[PDB]
């Protein structure tokens, strides 16, 4: 130990690296924020943050999530809008100043920290548009790579977030040949991009999703996992039983009832299928059940989800958009203007359902 370097990244393989997360929290709704049209980037490169309607992030927010025992935090980052033209699609200094800014939040905290590109307008699975989101791809991620070249192992990349093919009938159920050959091709640039970048991006823990990262058969099946880089995790995002969970139109429930279990039970088990039983670390980077003023109904779940995942060593990453109030997707669980945990009992059972002791700081007093 004595002589190392307070630089230096440690050599170790995602699924060992894996054992030391908690659970997570994604800061949504933020870095992801995409307001091109409606604000103009060119005169403000860095008020995306906070255009939809979250505040501009503290560190303090992250402490409270932190005394919670959340040490995973991804932070969904929309670059689209912030970059400039080929061949260089240079990002503009400012943003990526801030979202360094961001990232120091939890890292220099010792948590893990996820960065990614989330809502981008370049890199859809399609054919007739590949070999430009490829070119971007290599650009934009030898600079987030040369940017952060000298994080340790807590800060991971995830190159993709859902990539798909928008607007058709395939977007959602899992793709098609055309979708499936288009993710993978974009995925291998990603990781040939970082994996050859300066400083400790060679060993640095890298994320990739599966089309939409879906979790679904058809991305699964179709999804090419890499070989002999033991520093690779699959990307997957699941809000399951979506019911229960997401669906806002008419098949929407809010009672975590016999047949939302029946749908979770399946949907772990694909995840244990194609990836715990492969072999393949995963870490399934967003999910979350809204609010449907249904506390002890989503506590339940929120307990069996964590329990049936962490069953498995895989770890979840709750999507926190900062909503709370309206029609519309009510995911907050952090009041960041507060600085309180808004439904003490889902961290209760988050921290249970992990095994961990049962212990919510900062809860709101109602």
Same mark, same amino acid.
């Given at each position: 130990?004595?002589?190392?370097?307070?630089?230096? /990244?440690?050599?170790?393989?995602?699924?060992?690296?894996?054992?030391?997360?908690?659970?997570?929290?994604?800061? %949504?709704?933020?870095?992801?924020?995409?307001?091109?049209?409606?604000?103009? #980037?060119?005169?403000?490169?860095?008020?995306? @943050?906070?255009?939809? %309607?979250? +505040?501009?992030?503290?560190?303090?927010?992250?402490?409270?999530?932190?005394?919670?025992?959340?040490?995973?935090?991804?932070?969904?980052?929309?670059?689209?809008?912030?970059?400039?033209?080929?061949?260089?699609?240079?990002?503009?200094?400012?943003?990526?100043?801030?979202?360094?800014?961001?990232?120091?939040? +939890?890292?220099?905290?010792?948590?893990?920290?996820?960065?990614?590109?989330?809502?981008?307008?370049?890199?859809?699975?399609?054919?007739?548009?590949?070999?430009?989101?490829?070119?971007?791809?290599?650009?934009?991620?030898?600079?987030?790579?040369?940017?952060?070249?000298?994080?340790?192992?807590?800060?991971?990349? @995830?190159?993709?977030? &859902? =990539?798909?093919?928008?607007?058709? =009938?395939?977007?959602?159920?899992?793709?098609?040949?055309?979708?499936?050959?288009?993710?993978?091709?974009?995925?291998?640039?990603?990781?040939?991009?970082?994996?050859?970048?300066?400083?400790?991006?060679?060993?640095?823990?890298?994320?990739?999703? +599966?089309?939409?990262?879906?979790?679904?058969?058809?991305?699964?099946?179709?999804? /090419?996992?890499?070989?002999?880089?033991?520093?690779?995790?699959?990307?997957?995002?699941? #809000?399951?039983?979506?019911?229960?969970?997401?669906?806002?139109? &008419? $098949?929407?429930?809010?009672?975590?009832? !016999? !047949?939302?279990?029946?749908?979770?039970?399946?949907?772990?088990?694909?995840?244990?299928?194609?990836?715990?039983?492969? %072999?393949? =670390?995963?870490?399934?980077? &967003? #999910?979350?059940?809204?609010?449907?003023?249904?506390?002890?109904?989503?506590?339940?779940?929120?307990?069996? #989800?964590?329990?049936?995942?962490?069953?498995?060593?895989? =770890?979840?990453?709750?999507?926190?958009? $900062?909503?709370?109030?309206?029609?519309?997707?009510?995911?907050?669980?952090?009041?960041?203007?507060?600085?309180?945990?808004?439904? +003490?009992?889902?961290?209760?059972?988050?921290?249970?359902?992990? $095994?961990?002791?049962?212990?919510?700081?900062?809860?709101? @007093?109602?």
């Amino acid at each position: 130990h004595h002589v190392d370097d307070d630089d230096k /990244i440690r050599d170790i393989s995602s699924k060992e690296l894996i054992k030391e997360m908690n659970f997570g929290w994604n800061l %949504g709704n933020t870095m992801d924020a995409q307001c091109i049209e409606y604000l103009n #980037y060119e005169k403000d490169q860095t008020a995306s @943050e906070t255009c939809w %309607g979250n +505040p501009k992030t503290t560190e303090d927010m992250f402490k409270v999530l932190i005394d919670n025992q959340f040490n995973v935090f991804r932070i969904p980052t929309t670059w689209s809008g912030h970059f400039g033209e080929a061949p260089d699609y240079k990002i503009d200094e400012k943003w990526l100043k801030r979202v360094h800014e961001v990232v120091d939040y +939890p890292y220099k905290n010792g948590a893990f920290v996820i960065l990614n590109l989330h809502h981008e307008t370049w890199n859809h699975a399609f054919s007739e548009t590949l070999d430009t989101a490829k070119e971007i791809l290599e650009k934009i991620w030898s600079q987030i790579a040369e940017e952060f070249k000298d994080y340790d192992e807590h800060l991971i990349f @995830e190159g993709l977030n &859902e =990539p798909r093919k928008n607007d058709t =009938p395939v977007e959602w159920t899992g793709g098609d040949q055309e979708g499936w050959d288009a993710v993978n091709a974009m995925n291998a640039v990603f990781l040939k991009t970082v994996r050859s970048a300066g400083g400790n991006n060679p060993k640095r823990h890298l994320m990739i999703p +599966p089309y939409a990262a879906a979790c679904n058969e058809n991305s699964f099946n179709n999804f /090419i996992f890499p070989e002999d880089d033991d520093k690779v995790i699959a990307s997957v995002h699941a #809000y399951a039983p979506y019911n229960f969970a997401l669906n806002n139109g &008419e $098949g929407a429930v809010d009672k975590f009832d !016999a !047949a939302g279990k029946r749908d979770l039970e399946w949907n772990i088990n694909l995840m244990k299928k194609r990836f715990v039983d492969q %072999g393949i =670390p995963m870490i399934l980077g &967003e #999910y979350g059940a809204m609010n449907r003023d249904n506390e002890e109904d989503r506590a339940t779940w929120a307990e069996f #989800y964590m329990e049936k995942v962490t069953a498995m060593g895989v =770890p979840q990453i709750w999507w926190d958009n $900062g909503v709370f109030e309206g029609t519309g997707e009510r995911f907050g669980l952090l009041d960041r203007k507060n600085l309180k945990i808004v439904y +003490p009992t889902i961290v209760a059972a988050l921290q249970k359902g992990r $095994g961990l002791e049962v212990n919510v700081v900062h809860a709101i @007093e109602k």
